[PDB]
């Protein structure tokens, strides 16, 4: 496991301000490392890859630079819609880890809301999820995910997850093919991660949940070479408890 370290862990900013956000590697990842958006009770969004390229799509006020162990995400001049938590992940070696999250607060400001489009209600790009629900201690639970605008046994796919209140945490992944399953460390041997390619399908089966699991799964599907996913389902809760 690389343990990614950010810092600060919250920040409080006015608009206009420069905020710089730091990434620490406990080890040397090269420059697979790709920085996200989120705002609460929204999908995450894909701001930085491949360290320092920037998504198309996303004001050039964003920007990434380092490499090896220390990266840094800048916005050169923070605007009301800029206040949410910032994630950098590294996709240099499975488990894929995500940092703790850096939140963006305001201390004279207002923005539009709005999450980032995601499900099947956004464009281009469709992930409908659905199954998740409450079940007890030991129990089972199936997640799907239909897929739909893009050729899809052409992408990898991933399953995240964060518990209420915490950060965003990397549950497994699977090749386009299928060929190839990764997994945390913490659900191996209880989830199961696969694909229906004739029915352009992901899915998620879990087994023996335990209260840790408690969390909004998301589904995401991977974009270019250096691990980054480009869009993500709106999110669907799991609840295990008595």
């Known amino acids: 496991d690389i343990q990614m370290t950010q810092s600060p862990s919250s920040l409080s900013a006015s608009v206009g301000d420069r905020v710089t956000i730091t990434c620490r590697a406990s080890?040397?990842?090269?420059?697979?490392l790709n920085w996200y958006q989120q705002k609460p009770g929204c999908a995450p969004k894909l701001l930085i890859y491949?360290?320092?390229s920037l998504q198309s799509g996303v004001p050039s006020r964003f920007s990434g630079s380092g490499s090896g162990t220390d990266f840094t995400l800048t916005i050169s001049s923070l605007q009301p819609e800029d206040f949410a938590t910032y994630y950098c992940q590294q996709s240099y070696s499975t488990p894929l880890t995500f940092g703790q999250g850096t939140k963006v607060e305001i201390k004279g400001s207002g923005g539009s809301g709005g999450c980032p489009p995601c499900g099947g209600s956004g464009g281009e790009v469709q992930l409908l999820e659905s199954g998740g629900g409450l079940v007890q201690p030991g129990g089972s639970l199936r997640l799907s995910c239909a897929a739909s605008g893009f050729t899809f046994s052409s992408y990898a796919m991933s399953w995240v997850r964060q518990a209420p209140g915490k950060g965003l945490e990397w549950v497994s992944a699977?090749?386009?093919?299928?060929?190839?399953?990764y997994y945390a460390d913490s659900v191996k041997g209880r989830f199961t991660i696969s694909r229906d390619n004739s029915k352009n399908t992901l899915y998620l089966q879990m087994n023996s949940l335990r209260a840790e699991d408690t969390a909004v799964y998301y589904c995401?599907?991977?974009?270019?070479?250096?691990?980054?996913?480009?869009?993500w389902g709106c999110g669907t809760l799991v609840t295990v408890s008595s």
């Open positions: 080890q040397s990842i090269s420059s697979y």
């Open positions: 491949a360290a320092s």
């Open positions: 995401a599907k991977y974009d270019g070479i250096y691990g980054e996913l480009d869009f």
């Open positions: 699977i090749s386009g093919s299928g060929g190839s399953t």
